[PDB]
Design a protein around this nucleic acid. Structure first.
Ligand code: NA
Ligand code: NA
Ligand code: NA
Length: 320
DNA sequence: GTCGG
DNA sequence: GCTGATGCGC
DNA sequence: CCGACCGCGCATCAGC
């Protein structure tokens, strides 16, 4: 209903992140765009929007200007500035953030073609981002997410049957498509109390030509690129993350990385109401002075809901 | 840019 | 070479 | 009025 407005706000967000290097303004604009996107009426004025949380005085003014004129002069200015628009474009390459993009543009590197000419000036991450520029911007239909899941769960199984693997994100909530694949991994041998555990899994996924490129990889986190097996149309390359988490912190991690972010907000709020604090890693009781005690045992997501006396919420009912 | 202490 | 800072994506 | 707004793992750099 307010597609024009939320587009305007997103454009402003991208400009603050990429050109102004103002990450909190970026997120303020995103917050505004989200809350307006969800508003079940066609906004008729700035004052109306300002009733919404995340929408303040300045955004209300831009909404008035947009509604009267169908544009923002601030945005037209920005779009007609070659430097700003080139900086903004270059950050669409994974690995090229606001700093690299400004540096590149400063020396006349402004397009994909320019990057290709200057690949010697890119780091490994950036080269991969450039290589799969188009594929990385594609969404992943749920039916492919399911084929990808089966591959990952099976190959993990082949390395060792005690591995536990869970594909999280909006996917786990029943999303009809995903931006990437986020995999949480654990193993009985890994706990916060006390060895190539992730490597063995990455190596096997490479072995079967599922994982095709690595952006980064250490003992607990892998970020890379994967592709489904193809005499017909070859699949786009996709971003996959794999995180190795201690088993005693595993289901808190699943909970967190399943979201939604709004769901996590309401659940941490409710946990506090009842004398617990939940973060990505643990659920801890609060003493009366507000001192967090030791992390509680967690053997499943359900355990966390139990502790705070909340009725178990199916992942697909976790929109908020 | 918006919010809350 | 070593340590701590920064950039980056999440 | 003023600081918070998540903060972490990894790659790379800055400074030594
Ligand atoms: Na508001
Ligand atoms: Na980028
Ligand atoms: Na605050």
């Amino acid at each position: 209903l307010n597609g024009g407005i939320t587009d305007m706000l997103t454009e402003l967000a991208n400009f603050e992140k990429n050109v102004s290097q103002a990450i909190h303004k970026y997120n303020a604009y995103r917050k505004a765009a989200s809350v307006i996107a969800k508003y079940p009426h066609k906004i008729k004025s700035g004052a109306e929007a300002k009733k919404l949380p995340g929408v303040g005085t300045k955004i209300a003014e831009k909404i008035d200007e947009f509604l009267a004129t169908g544009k923002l002069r601030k945005l037209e200015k920005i779009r007609q500035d070659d430097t700003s628009s080139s900086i903004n474009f270059l950050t669409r390459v994974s690995g090229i953030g606001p700093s690299a993009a400004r540096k590149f543009v400063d020396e006349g590197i402004k397009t994909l073609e320019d990057l290709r000419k200057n690949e010697d000036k890119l780091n490994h991450h950036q080269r991969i981002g450039l290589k799969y520029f188009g594929d990385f911007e594609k969404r992943i239909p749920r039916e492919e997410m399911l084929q990808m899941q089966d591959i990952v769960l099976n190959e993990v199984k082949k390395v060792d049957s005690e591995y536990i693997a869970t594909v999280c994100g909006s996917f786990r909530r029943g999303a009809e498509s995903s931006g990437d694949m986020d995999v949480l991994l654990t193993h009985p041998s890994f706990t916060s109390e006390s060895p190539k555990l992730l490597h063995q899994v990455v190596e096997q996924l490479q072995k079967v030509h599922f994982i095709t490129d690595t952006l980064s990889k250490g003992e607990t986190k892998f970020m890379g690129v994967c592709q489904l097996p193809s005499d017909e149309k070859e699949y786009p390359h996709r971003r996959i993350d794999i995180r190795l988490i201690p088993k005693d912190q595993y289901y808190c991690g699943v909970l967190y990385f399943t979201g939604s972010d709004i769901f996590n907000k309401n659940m941490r709020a409710h946990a506090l109401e009842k004398g617990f604090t939940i973060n990505e890693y643990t659920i801890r009781p609060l003493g009366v002075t507000g001192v967090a005690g030791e992390p509680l045992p967690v053997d499943s997501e359900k355990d966390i809901f139990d502790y705070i006396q909340w009725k178990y919420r199916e992942p697909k009912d976790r929109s908020e």
